A paper describes a structure:
Influenza virus hemagglutinin (HA) engages the host sialylated glycan receptor at the receptor-binding site (RBS) to initiate the virus life cycle. Based on sequence database analysis and virus rescue experiments, this study revealed that the two most common egg-adaptive mutations on H3N2 HA, namely G186V and L194P, are incompatible. X-ray structures illustrate that individual G186V and L194P mutations have opposing effects on the HA receptor-binding site (RBS), and when both G186V and L194P are present, the RBS is severely disrupted.
To dissect the impact of the G186V mutation, a crystal structure of IVR-165 HA, which is the triple mutant H156Q/G186V/S219Y of Vic11 HA, was determined at a resolution of 2.25 Å. The distance between the 190-helix and 220-loop in IVR-165 HA RBS is slightly larger than that in the Vic11 HA RBS. The other two egg-adaptive mutations H156Q and S219Y have little, if any, influence on the distance between the 190-helix and 220-loop. H156Q abolishes a hydrogen bond between the 150-loop and 190-helix, whereas S219Y stabilizes the N165 glycan from the neighboring promoter of the trimer by forming a stacking interaction with the glycan. The heights of the RBS of Wy03 and IVR-165, as measured by the distance between OH98 and Cα190, are 9.3 and 9.5 Å, respectively.
Residue numbers in the entry:
A (entry chain B), D (entry chain B), F (entry chain B): 1 to 173
B (entry chain A), C (entry chain A), E (entry chain A): 9 to 325
The structure:
């Protein structure tokens, strides 16, 4: 995808994450765990639902039209009726092909984007207390128990609380 | 020691293949179908007013073929013509059959008003053994077969003004006898002539006496014509034999009515979109069931499937 | 202490709602309208050559109805036909009226060249009280009503070669008298016959004697026909009564000319795009004023508004 | 938007910035201020003008066509004339709808992108002398008066001049 | 000291200008053309079955103009009609020429089956000096000019049932003599009449006696008509003079056949896409060579070039 | 482009890189050099080939149609035949114009993206051992000979090996 996260620097998805589309796995002093991120998940879902709302249940009413099957050979007029219809169908068929290709490229890109946004947000949050391992994981350079990990996931992590501990751990020899 | 925090995304074990700008096969976590590819095999009677032609074509119902008497004055959103339909009255043809069928279909009504045409000097109500109604010889219900009276057929010059605020549709015909003999027996002179006119139109027809191949054992024919007469205008029938006269006019309306060729049975159900294959759901934007449709329908496309991604790229573990 | 440096972007208090792929309502700082939804209610006389039909249809101007004499030999880019137009000469019809109107409209000229047809044995220049010009009985300016001379109408066999490098358009007609009496009074024989031919075509017409409903109190008619004659070809009129003869030919050109039905007044202004509602600006790519257009025009669409974002997402404080 | 800056990590726009689309607000020893960035502003504007030039004042000339209103009932030919026109209009109406949706998605994304580019450029410029606070703001870890702030905005800021001061401030206890 | 590591991308000295959403001129490293703008100037004989009309129109090959005898029973995917084609048999016209040409073109075969029509009381095989075959007077190969025998022409009433499982296409005509004299010399009565009918159709034609401008010095004409007869149906020719009789029927098929007007020479080569300019390669999705095409062809567009970027933005050093 | 790398923070391309689309130039103790990155190059090429495969050699067969040139003036029917064809051609011409514009915007953006992905990947790889100079170059704060540079290009660079040396060089006075 165009952001390079999904099928990119994130090696693979998590089949065992069934309560969200994006989220966090951690390991700390109290174990290892997983939690879905609802905001990023909802952001992706809302956008996909927006597309769907623009395409599902939105059909157009037509009534009396032209004939499109013919039991007799007639020549010029019938040639024209058939050509008009063939023309129309090919144009709509093209429209449908293009629409799906564009929509699908865009869906993949926007979902990749949301993954990237969550990663970026988390990176900035951690400030000088963690380093990016390159695979979507941060090495957090301080004790970070379950409440600490929760604080990161919930946006209440105060980097200043841990900064001294983290800098000492990062920049030791 | 510290901690590790990994960001990630879900995946499924059963992904679906979709197309993009650059890839004709890429797996996403989920997708939805955009092409409706099936029908339920019946035309739902709701919410459109369906009129099943059964054995009658619309034109036969119009003319009043005896098996079509139950159709008198009926309206429809969609008239359904069956492939088994057949005529069983006097054999006929309609020059520009397709246009008459179309304009009646589109009008959406068989509403007929009788009118008292001044037919003096001729025998009215001619019947035939080629058009049986309730075991008697009969004729088209909406047509009046005029023949000689006292071995005479005088020159008709009959007027009918349209003082309504709607158009009137007149259906009338010419009889083509099989022989010069039959011609004189019916109309008292060797050569028929019909002129039907209005302020803004004139249609002139000469019969062609001669044999045609037999249809239901009849080698003669009737040719059917029509004339629309607007408000303030007047219908003039100026004839000297061979006229198959109108008994009145059909109302012509405008609106959403049409006609469809189908052998699908009518069901007691509710579906907005009708195709000749049967009604189809209209949740999807596209369909490949039939290019022929009526109502709020997905657009016909050639593809049998188009999958819209509804999830991210699927990257299994 | 140090400093803080914040990156940011503008916003406005009055944003505009636009559509995207995923959102049918999202606010941006600015947008521009892509659908032209109004006209100025008049058809600008510039830069296209406008010919206002006034009381004349193009066909009436062609035939030379007396109120249309001011139209002789005029050209147009766009002929404008008014709904109030009416004929006031001999009542007539044109089989495939629509095609003659179209081909003349498209040609864009009423340029007429007189030709000296050899009309021997008949009275030329027939007139009527149904076609008044300058208080006298008259006729269509471009047509020559031929009648009997000395109670005779001999067989005409008149030739006119096209030795020009352009096509010639010939307009001619058939008169339908009201009675067998009137027929003999005018043409000396009971049955008319007209044959107009070229190397590559032949049109044969028999008059139909009889009453039609009165138009401006006249119950007779003229039926109008046309014939195009190419370079190296020849017009042959082989007639024995009832001919309404051409006096010459119209030039047929090709180019950008057309015709439009409109009641919008002509204004002294300059606009590239004409609709029946009036001229419309053509800055926008789309318009919902009228599907009927002439000139450099936005494309007709069903939407009444389509807003193109011309700024970023608007995120007020 | 797909970059996550506008209506993303940048909380909101600035109504009081009327001389550009993107820019800088600062606080330092000499006060607080705002300045537009002309390059990013012009980059967005140029792209939007490019679109507009592809759509405004570019109409197509048609002359004699087919009739599209009819005073008489005719059947087959008129059915065909009406169907051809209805077909055409629906195809153009679709084209117009799609065009605007795509253009608008793209305009939002490109404007989000330019915001992101300016942020990234500034981040790299500051090197080890500042940290990203996560909301589009950098905490600059040295005295940075008006000329200093100007130097950042103008691309003449020499990070080496302040690096010792900044590192000492960043990595203190 | 340490090191420096710079990330970068390629560039070329000769970039190509392409269009994007926002820029009508931006340079990329490489691009490919999407509009085919040239032909090789010849129509490849493979892989479609090409039939070069040479001096014959399809209709002349159908009727059996003597220079077209080599075309008998041939099939084609594409019939190529040359602008130099000319008729050299009895001068004729075809009402709705365009439709007959179209339906034969589309059928893709000149397969003709002779049938033994019961022509009793008339002289068969009439010939003319206007249709020379092998230095003798002749006629159209597929048509049978019937004339009087022993100064009589009795009433014909000839039947031909279609007991095949395909449709039959019948071509027949009416002769228009130049004089009442010539009429009697040929058909023994002053007025011809032809009626051709089936169960589902009837075509009636009266000759028009009179002069037409000379074509190859002949001032008389033949008008050509056609009739399709389905399985279970019957052809009835009920005539009393002036009939140009069919000798049999053409098979009508359906499939991929057509006709094209072109003066491009036929080459010994292989190309899927044919235009009147010659065959064109079909690697590109679009083409601006000709709106007229046959086979697997790029779609006609107005642009003469559309460059698809196949590389990144080019940023020279 | 939408990522801001190509014709953005990367000042210009390299005409002398003829064996790939993206790559690395270095300077170290043993000289200066260039090497193509095959993975990023192939990622761009694969995507462009994917487009091409959707557009080249994929034509549609039509056989008997309507006439499109006329030797006689006919009026209504011919007006309709001409209008149907003109309608069709204008719709396809629009489709072709739009397609190329969208495809080309996308090609530029995806190629910009791949440049950006390679830069990001390299940045993360280097961890605390290098700093981003803002122009696509990293100042690597340790001795990094040819094998070392090769290890970065090949994804076998072990940042821990050099971290002490690099931190000392970065955070000196
Ligand atoms: C894969 O993607 C598709 C598309 O996003 C997704 O299908 C959607 O699923 C939802 C939920 O299952 C469907 O919503 C339902 O639609 C039906 C039929 O129209 C309605 O009857 C339902 O209404 C009831 O339920 C609602 C709450 O869910 C109640 O609020 C309501 O009052 C009713 O009780 C309901 O709206 C939706 O129709 C489909 N969409 C499509 C296009 O099929 C699918 O679930 C995804 N698959 C996976 C594995 O995620
Ligand atoms: C919201 O977005 C729209 C579209 O981007 C934007 O509208 C544009 O504004 C500019 C400037 O106001 C307009 O440009 C003018 O157009 C008129 C009419 O065609 C011309 O007469 C003008 O020419 C004069 O001025 C020029 C300098 O501005 C001179 O160089 C020239 O010689 C003339 O003196 C001028 O070009 C432009 O037409 C509109 N575009 C559209 C599509 O309306 C609008 O301003 C934006 N709104 C906000 C609040 O930003
Ligand atoms: C600029 O961009 C275009 C499009 O990407 C690019 O053109 C392509 O180049 C390749 C390689 O030169 C072409 O591939 C060849 O096509 C021909 C004709 O169809 C085939 O005969 C060739 O087959 C032989 O070679 C193959 C290996 O290359 C063998 O495997 C095979 O068995 C044959 O021996 C070959 O497939 C391709 O056709 C073009 N595409 C287009 C649309 O023109 C061009 O090279 C790029 N320019 C630069 C400077 O990069
Ligand atoms: C002119 O030719 C037509 C067509 O061939 C002739 O029509 C045929 O006329 C005969 C005479 O009765 C018909 O025979 C009848 O058939 C019915 C049905 O099977 C049968 O029950 C009767 O006992 C009788 O045999 C025949 O069907 C009919 N054919 C067609 C195709 O219509 C006609 O006789 C000729 N006319 C003249 C005046 O010579
Ligand atoms: C055949 O029928 C037509 C149609 O009904 C008859 O036409 C009518 O003829 C009368 C006789 O003159 C017309 O009356 C005149 O009307 C004018 C206008 O108001 C008036 O000024 C005169 O004093 C006179 O009353 C009548 O308008 C006309 N009707 C129509 C509809 O055209 C015709 O008479 C019949 N023909 C024959 C030969 O019997
Ligand atoms: C009715 O008018 C037509 C059309 O003008 C007359 O046709 C013309 O008839 C003459 C008499 O033979 C033709 O002349 C011949 O021309 C040929 C070819 O050059 C020449 O070799 C002969 O020696 C002779 O001169 C003339 O071509 C012909 N014109 C056309 C246009 O067909 C016809 O004579 C008139 N009919 C009657 C019955 O009066
Ligand atoms: C709906 O009916 C149509 C028309 O009968 C079907 O399309 C035809 O299918 C048959 C058999 O598969 C083919 O021989 C014809 O060539 C098809 N005609 C056309 C015009 O496509 C169609 O298969 C039916 N669809 C469904 C879902 O029932
Ligand atoms: C429609 O026509 C069919 C066939 O003509 C009718 O079915 C026949 O009806 C007769 C008379 O009652 C029965 O003797 C036969 O059993 C039926 N024949 C066949 C082949 O089915 C049918 O009744 C008519 N339907 C309507 C609604 O009028
Ligand atoms: C331009 O004129 C057209 C045609 O008269 C108008 O469209 C019609 O509007 C009336 C009244 O609103 C409706 O009853 C018709 O159904 C409309 N016809 C069609 C074909 O759409 C249109 O409103 C006018 N537009 C402007 C801007 O003046
Ligand atoms: C177009 O026709 C109208 C109506 O026939 C003309 O208006 C009438 O002209 C007469 C004769 O001078 C006047 O007595 C009336 O006052 C007008 N009647 C009405 C109802 O307006 C009009 O003059 C004609 N216009 C042109 C340009 O010839
Ligand atoms: C293919 O032939 C067509 C038709 O002859 C050419 O298009 C015509 O070109 C001439 C001279 O340039 C113009 O006068 C006509 O107006 C064109 N007609 C149409 C319908 O466009 C075309 O130039 C030829 N193309 C090639 C590549 O040979
Ligand atoms: C097609 O017609 C042309 C012209 O009618 C024929 O060419 C002439 O043939 C004659 C008779 O052998 C020669 O005397 C002339 O030299 C030719 N004239 C011209 C102007 O070329 C040609 O032979 C015919 N072609 C076919 C295949 O029948
Ligand atoms: C974080 O939010 C979760 C979700 O509701 C909550 O249960 C948890 O207590 C929070 N943890 C911390 C440390 O704030
Ligand atoms: C995938 O498998 C699950 C598990 O049974 C099923 O519920 C789901 O509907 C499947 N989804 C798709 C899109 O195939
Ligand atoms: C019309 O009616 C009148 C009066 O009855 C009569 O003289 C005339 O011949 C009729 N016309 C036709 C064409 O029958
Ligand atoms: C928004 O408001 C300002 C202030 O009056 C006005 O000048 C501007 O034109 C408005 N813009 C839009 C797009 O509504
Ligand atoms: C054509 O003119 C000639 C000579 O005047 C005449 O004999 C013939 O009858 C005319 N034909 C017609 C159809 O009037
Ligand atoms: C930065 O550029 C501005 C804009 O012209 C200029 O006025 C200012 O003096 C510059 N400041 C510095 C510190 O370079
Ligand atoms: C650019 O120049 C090179 C060097 O001669 C040439 O081989 C190549 O084909 C050119 N490419 C394009 C796309 O013009
Ligand atoms: C008519 O010509 C055909 C074909 O040359 C021949 O078989 C037949 O015997 C001829 N018929 C008569 C009656 O001369
Ligand atoms: C049809 O043939 C019969 C018998 O030969 C004859 O009486 C009748 O006049 C013919 N009809 C025509 C129109 O020639
Ligand atoms: C890196 O990979 C290249 C490419 O094959 C190889 O030749 C080189 O030896 C590798 N260098 C190191 C230091 O791993």
């Amino acid at each position: 995808g165009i952001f390079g996260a999904i099928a990119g620097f994130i090696e693979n998805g998590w089949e065992g994450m069934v309560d969200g589309w994006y989220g966090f796995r951690h390991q700390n002093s109290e174990g290892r765990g997983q939690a879905a991120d609802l905001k990023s998940t909802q952001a992706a879902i809302d956008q996909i639902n927006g597309k769907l709302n623009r395409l599902i249940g939105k059909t157009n009413e037509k009534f009396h039209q032209i004939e499109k099957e013919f039991s007799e050979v007639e020549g010029r007029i019938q040639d024209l009726e058939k050509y008009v219809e063939d023309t129309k169908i090919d144009l709509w068929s093209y429209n449908a092909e293009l629409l799906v290709a564009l929509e699908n490229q865009h869906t993949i890109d926007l979902t990749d984007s949301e993954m990237n946004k969550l990663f970026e947000k988390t990176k900035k949050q951690l400030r000088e207390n963690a380093e990016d391992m390159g695979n979507g994981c941060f090495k957090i350079y301080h004790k970070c128990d379950n409440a600490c990990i929760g604080s990161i996931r919930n946006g209440t992590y105060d980097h200043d609380v841990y900064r001294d501990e983290a800098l000492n751990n990062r920049f030791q020899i | 020691p510290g901690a590790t925090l990994c960001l990630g995304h879900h995946a499924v074990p059963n992904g679906t293949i979709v197309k993009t700008i650059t890839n004709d096969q890429i797996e996403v976590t989920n997708a939805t179908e955009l092409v409706q590819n099936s029908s339920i095999g019946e035309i739902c009677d709701s919410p459109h007013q369906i009129l099943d032609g059964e054995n009658c074509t619309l034109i036969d119902a119009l003319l009043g073929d005896p098996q079509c008497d139950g159709f008198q004055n009926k309206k429809w959103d969609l008239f359904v013509e069956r492939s088994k339909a057949y005529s069983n009255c006097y054999p006929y043809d309609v020059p520009d059959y397709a246009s008459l069928r179309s304009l009646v279909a589109s009008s959406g009504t068989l509403e007929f008003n009788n009118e008292s045409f001044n037919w003096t000097g001729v025998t009215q109500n001619g019947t035939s053994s080629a058009c049986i109604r309730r075991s008697n010889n009969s004729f088209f219900s909406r047509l009046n077969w005029l023949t000689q009276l006292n071995f005479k057929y005088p020159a008709l010059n009959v007027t009918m003004p349209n003082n309504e605020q709607f158009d009137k549709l007149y259906i009338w015909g010419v009889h083509h006898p099989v022989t010069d003999k039959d011609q004189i027996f019916l109309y008292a002179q060797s050569s028929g002539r019909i002129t039907v006119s209005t302020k803004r139109s004139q249609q002139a027809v000469i019969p062609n006496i001669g044999y045609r191949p037999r249809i239901r054992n009849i080698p003669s024919r009737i040719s059917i014509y029509w004339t629309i007469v607007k408000p303030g205008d007047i219908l003039l029938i100026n004839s000297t034999g061979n006229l198959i006269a109108p008994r009145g006019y059909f109302k012509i309306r405008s609106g959403k009515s049409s006609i469809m060729r189908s052998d699908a049975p009518i069901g007691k159900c509710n579906s907005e979109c009708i195709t000749p294959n049967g009604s189809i759901p209209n949740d999807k934007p596209f369909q490949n069931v039939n290019r022929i449709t009526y109502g709020a329908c997905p657009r016909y496309v050639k593809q049998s499937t188009l999958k819209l991604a509804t999830g991210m790229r699927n990257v299994p573990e």
